[PDB]
Write an enzyme that holds these catalytic residues in place. Structure first.
Site, short mmCIF file in Angstrom:
data_model
loop_
_atom_site.label_atom_id
_atom_site.label_comp_id
_atom_site.label_asym_id
_atom_site.label_seq_id
_atom_site.Cartn_x
_atom_site.Cartn_y
_atom_site.Cartn_z
N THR A 1 -7.10 3.27 -2.14
CA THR A 1 -6.75 1.86 -1.88
C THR A 1 -7.72 0.80 -2.41
O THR A 1 -7.31 -0.10 -3.15
CB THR A 1 -6.54 1.63 -0.38
OG1 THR A 1 -5.41 2.39 0.04
CG2 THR A 1 -6.29 0.15 -0.08
N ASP B 1 -21.97 5.30 -29.09
CA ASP B 1 -23.43 5.40 -29.10
C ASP B 1 -24.04 4.86 -30.38
O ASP B 1 -23.49 5.06 -31.48
CB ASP B 1 -23.87 6.85 -28.98
CG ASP B 1 -23.65 7.43 -27.60
OD1 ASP B 1 -23.24 6.68 -26.68
OD2 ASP B 1 -23.86 8.65 -27.46
N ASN C 1 -13.28 5.22 -1.55
CA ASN C 1 -13.19 4.56 -0.24
C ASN C 1 -14.50 4.76 0.54
O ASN C 1 -14.81 3.98 1.43
CB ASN C 1 -11.98 5.04 0.57
CG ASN C 1 -10.67 4.29 0.22
OD1 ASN C 1 -10.67 3.20 -0.39
ND2 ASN C 1 -9.55 4.88 0.64
N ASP D 1 0.82 -1.20 0.00
CA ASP D 1 0.00 0.00 0.00
C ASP D 1 0.87 1.26 0.00
O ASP D 1 1.84 1.37 0.76
CB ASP D 1 -0.94 0.00 1.21
CG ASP D 1 -2.15 0.85 0.99
OD1 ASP D 1 -2.04 1.88 0.32
OD2 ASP D 1 -3.25 0.48 1.43
#
Ligand SMILES: *[C@@H]1O[C@H](CO)[C@@H](O[C@@H]2O[C@H](CO)[C@@H](O[C@@H]3O[C@H](CO[C@H]4O[C@H](CO)[C@@H](O)[C@H](O[C@H]5O[C@H](CO)[C@@H](O)[C@H](O)[C@@H]5O[C@H]5O[C@H](CO)[C@@H](O)[C@H](O)[C@@H]5O)[C@@H]4O)[C@@H](O)[C@H](O[C@H]4O[C@H](CO)[C@@H](O)[C@H](O)[C@@H]4O[C@H]4O[C@H](CO)[C@@H](O)[C@H](O)[C@@H]4O)[C@@H]3O)[C@H](O)[C@H]2NC(C)=O)[C@H](O)[C@H]1NC(C)=O
Ligand SMILES: Cc1cc(OC(F)(F)F)ccc1COC(=O)N1CCn2nc(C(=O)N3CCc4[nH]nnc4C3)cc2C1
Ligand SMILES: [Ca+2]
Ligand SMILES: [Ca+2]
Ligand SMILES: [Cl-]
Ligand SMILES: [K+]
Ligand code: NA
Ligand SMILES: [Zn+2]
EC number: 3.1.4.39
Length: 806
Positions: free
Chosen positions: A159, A691, A180, A121
């Site tokens: 994260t 589209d 988060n 991390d």
């Protein structure tokens, strides 16, 4: 309720999860408060520490120890990772020279090289060089295996969005973990980091690697580790799992470290306090590799060292307050921090107006450190719009800054010195990738790539078929020694028509005029060849794009450019032209300023008309091949064909004109010729995908001329710039953009100034991968080159970011 009366005896870190109210012994039970009474005692032993010491060698197995130095420990698979070094005179893995791993060297009964993902991390890309002295294990992995200088995370660079992107190959907008913190208006439910709602399956979309493995008969260690479980214990558990019987043993494993992120938030990305957490991570990597070597698995297992995002310097004083902009501050909910998301506090409040909120946040202060966007106007490269959990109003916050609602929210909720979440192009947010093992290449550097690409590769590494995802499968083949995935070009669905001259001038009533009535087989046999495609080898360098959906279109040839003209959308889907370094810029003659000419190869009924543009007071028009770059006064008349015309807001014409008149020539000078493919994009439902005609929400007034949401250009040259674009013998170089087609330049705070102060900066913000343009147009580019398809796939995933060096 959990009747925690059962026992973890022999069940420590069991791979299958028993159904409550039976007590659990798996590595997730802590986060559920459902572990058996004896879990800590039996499964979280700590006695004696984590290392064998000289006087522990040959000892009598004492079950209370965290790990063992007894003789039977290898067979039991529970030695301390340094056992052989201390007791058997073995060396640490880090001290061994590296030797190419040409083939997996695995013990009998291993059906495939295991994959271990070692995820860290907040591991900023520059730590690899900057912390190199204190990370010898990571550094051997890096220099002996395959590494990138950095890996690009997804937006937001938080994260959970990133770890779940790594596991699924999906953009947050598709996997559903868009921040988060989240609110899902359909569920009427909120997702938070702290708390229990986040464990509900309905938040988590797509199919993560562990489920992909499981459904295809490949066993997985569990990916989620509880915070209280110490790193050393996570390592030993993985090593234990690797000593299990063939039929029970998983093939894929994950380790996770909360560091260096945890310390980074407190001390900043390069705080002096950051050295220690980096040493510690390296020590953990050492223990893994020593343990693998002990088990004769260090030349068998593929190891991936991967981060989720970097870390930037951010302090409390660098905070913008919405209360300095909005009078109505209490009628809104803000998701705050390194990005901003705004919705109404109450759905019963019919006086809440997003339009006036955005206006009140637009270029209000000289050095304003955030920019408001409606989510569909965010740069397309962020792929951050197609999910009901993403609020309509979004704030892109400048690197190093925070946004908050009121000052009270800051001092009543300086603490922190680091944070992350910013735009995924920001250098400080970049993270790492290293692959080491039989399946990865030896001492190889690969170019930076996006973390969305890894799922496919981890699937390749485990012989799995990947679930549908946003990676481009094959684009990372150059990371792999073997196990490559050999993709084939998508089949063209629609073949073009090749219209000749079929209509007389007088059949058109488009309300268009042109001052062009001036007149010889010298210059007439010549112009015939140009309309049959004699210069097509010059302007169409990589073959024509393939149309990958069912439609009706025409290839139109010209001296200076070639186009694929849509009879459905009444404009080109693509316009291809080459500008050499020698090419010259001319202006539009006075007499030809308003000149639009009918195209005698294309019916009136499949043409635009000038009247519609006259009646539409909001909408003007531009051209895809620029008049300024005509090769000759006679060639210039081609650039004014009604079939080269596209609808453009006057505000956007400022951007487009500067691109065509100034930037194209500049890039040609700098890159030794450029090939340009430009065209319209329609993405009214902001899903990142082309589209259908029935999805278009805006037309040029009184007509069936559809208004693009964006204009793209793909700009290709030779990577070896000593060779000209039109005579390149090797690898290509590309940069592309998807510019929003907006009625104003509100996005650019400097726009009342000259285009030379703001336009290129806007373009840079809207840099794109060719692959993004493919999704948005249903075209497939680079069909005919001398390059291998895998290299082309890599080229198509390239993003020119315009950041400094890392
Ligand atoms: C990145 O890669 C991903 C993965 O490849 C791409 O996303 C895919 O795009 C497909 C095309 O848009 C899409 O296919 C549709 O699937 C619909 C059923 O999908 C369900 O089942 C799948 C498979 O298990 C599952 O993955 C889906 O999961 C989504 O939804 C759940 C619950 O909401 C979430 O948990 C999950 O995160 C995911 O959400 C995301 O996708 C949905 C769209 O599905 C978004 O709305 C969310 O915002 C979020 O981003 C589903 O559980 C299926 O119903 C569709 O079929 C309709 O449309 C076709 C057009 O061909 C038509 O023929 C059909 O008739 C049908 O129309 C009917 O419904 C219409 C609308 O309700 C209605 O107007 C009509 O009248 C009809 O009644 C369609 O086939 C696929 O689901 C997703 N997959 C994922 C995982 O997101 C993505 O495009 C790539 N991005 C880029 C830029 O390339
Ligand atoms: C889901 C996946 C794929 C991988 O790889 C891949 F899929 F790519 F293969 C790897 C790991 C994983 C999952 O990882 C985990 O085990 N966990 C998920 C992340 N996580 N966050 C916490 C936490 O509470 N915080 C730690 C960070 C922090 N910093 N400050 N405060 C905090 C608070 C606990 C965990 C456990
Ligand atoms: Ca993180
Ligand atoms: Ca769309
Ligand atoms: Cl968030
Ligand atoms: K007009
Ligand atoms: Na402006
Ligand atoms: Zn963090």
């Amino acid at each position: 309720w959990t009747a925690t009366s059962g026992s973890c005896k022999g069940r420590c870190f069991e791979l299958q999860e028993v159904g409550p109210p039976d007590c659990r012994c798996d590595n997730l039970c802590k986060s559920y408060s459902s572990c058996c009474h004896d879990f800590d005692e039996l499964c979280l032993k700590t006695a004696r520490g984590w290392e064998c010491t000289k006087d522990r060698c040959g000892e009598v197995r004492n079950e209370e120890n965290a790990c063992h130095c007894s003789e039977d420990c290898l067979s039991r698979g529970d030695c301390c990772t340094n056992y052989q070094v201390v007791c058997k005179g073995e060396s640490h893995w880090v001290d061994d020279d590296c030797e190419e791993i040409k083939v997996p060297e695995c013990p009998a009964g291993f059906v495939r090289p295991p994959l271990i993902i070692f995820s860290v991390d907040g591991f900023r890309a520059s730590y690899m060089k900057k912390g190199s002295k204190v990370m010898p294990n990571i550094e051997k992995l890096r220099s002996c295996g395959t590494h990138a200088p950095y890996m690009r995370p997804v937006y937001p660079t938080k994260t959970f969005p990133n770890l779940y992107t790594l596991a699924t190959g999906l953009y947050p907008e598709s996997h559903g973990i868009v921040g988060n913190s989240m609110y899902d208006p359909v569920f009427d439910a909120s997702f938070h980091l702290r708390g229990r709602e986040k464990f509900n399956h309905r938040w988590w979309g797509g199919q993560p690697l562990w489920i992909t493995a499981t459904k295809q008969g490949v066993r997985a260690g569990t990916f989620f580790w509880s915070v209280s479980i110490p790193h050393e214990r996570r390592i030993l558990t993985i090593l234990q799992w690797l000593s299990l019987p063939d039929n029970e043993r998983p093939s894929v494993y994950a380790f996770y470290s909360e560091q260096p992120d945890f310390s980074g938030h407190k001390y900043g990305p390069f705080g002096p306090e950051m050295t220690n957490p980096l040493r510690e991570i390296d020590k953990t990597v050492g223990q893994l590799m020593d343990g693998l070597k002990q088990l004769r698995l260090h030349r068998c297992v593929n190891v991936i060292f991967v981060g989720d995002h970097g870390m930037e310097d951010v302090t409390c004083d660098r905070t913008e307050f919405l209360s300095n902009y909005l009078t109505n501050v209490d009628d809104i909910t803000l998701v705050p921090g390194t990005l901003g998301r705004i919705r109404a506090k109450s759905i019963n409040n019919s006086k809440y107006d997003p339009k006036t909120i955005i206006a009140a946040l637009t270029c209000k202060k000289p050095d304003q450190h955030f920019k408001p966007y409606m989510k569909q106007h965010l740069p397309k490269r962020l792929h951050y719009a197609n999910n009901r959990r993403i609020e309509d109003i979004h704030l892109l916050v400048d690197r190093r800054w925070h946004v908050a609602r009121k000052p009270l929210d800051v001092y009543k909720k300086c603490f922190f010195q680091g944070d992350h979440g910013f735009d995924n192009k920001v250098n400080s947010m970049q993270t790492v990738f290293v692959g080491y093992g039989p399946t990865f290449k030896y001492r190889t550097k690969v170019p930076p790539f996006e973390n969305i690409e890894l799922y496919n590769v981890m699937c390749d590494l485990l012989g799995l078929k990947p679930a549908p995802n946003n990676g481009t499968h094959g684009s990372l083949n150059h990371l792999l020694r073997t196990n490559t995935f050999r993709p084939t070009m998508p089949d063209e669905v629609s073949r073009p028509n090749y219209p000749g001259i079929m209509y007389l001038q007088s059949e058109f009533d488009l309300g268009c005029t042109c001052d062009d009535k001036v007149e010889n087989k010298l210059e007439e046999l010549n112009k015939r060849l140009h309309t049959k495609g004699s210069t097509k080898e010059r302007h169409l360098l990589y073959g024509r794009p393939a149309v990958l959906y069912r439609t009706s279109y025409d290839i139109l040839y010209h001296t200076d450019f070639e186009s694929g003209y849509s009879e459905i959308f009444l404009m080109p889907l693509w316009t291809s032209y080459t500008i050499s370094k020698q090419a010259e810029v001319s202006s539009i003659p006075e007499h030809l300023t308003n000149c639009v000419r009918p195209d005698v190869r294309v019916s009136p009924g499949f043409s635009q008309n000038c009247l519609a543009y006259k009646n539409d007071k909001q909408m003007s028009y531009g051209f895809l091949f620029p008049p300024y770059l005509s090769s000759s006064p006679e060639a210039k008349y081609d650039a004014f064909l009604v079939t080269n015309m596209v609808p453009m807001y006057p505000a956007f014409k400022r951007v487009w004109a500067y691109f065509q008149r100034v930037l194209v020539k500049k890039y040609a000078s700098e890159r030794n010729g450029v090939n340009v493919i430009s065209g319209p994009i329609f993405d009214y439902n902001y899903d990142g995908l082309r589209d259908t005609e029935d999805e278009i929400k805006q037309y040029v007034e009184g007509s069936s001329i559809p208004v693009p949401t964006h204009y793209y250009s793909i700009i290709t040259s030779c990577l070896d710039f000593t060779q000209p674009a039109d005579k390149c013998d090797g690898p290509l170089s590309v940069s592309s953009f998807i510019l929003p087609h907006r009625p104003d330049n509100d996005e650019s705070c400097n726009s009342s100034e000259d285009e030379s102060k703001w336009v290129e900066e806007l373009m840079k913000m809207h840099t794109a991968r060719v692959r993004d343009i493919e999704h948005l147009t249903g075209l497939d580019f680079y069909r005919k080159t001398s390059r291998s398809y895998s290299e082309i796939l890599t080229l198509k995933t390239y993003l020119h970011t315009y950041e400094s060096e890392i």
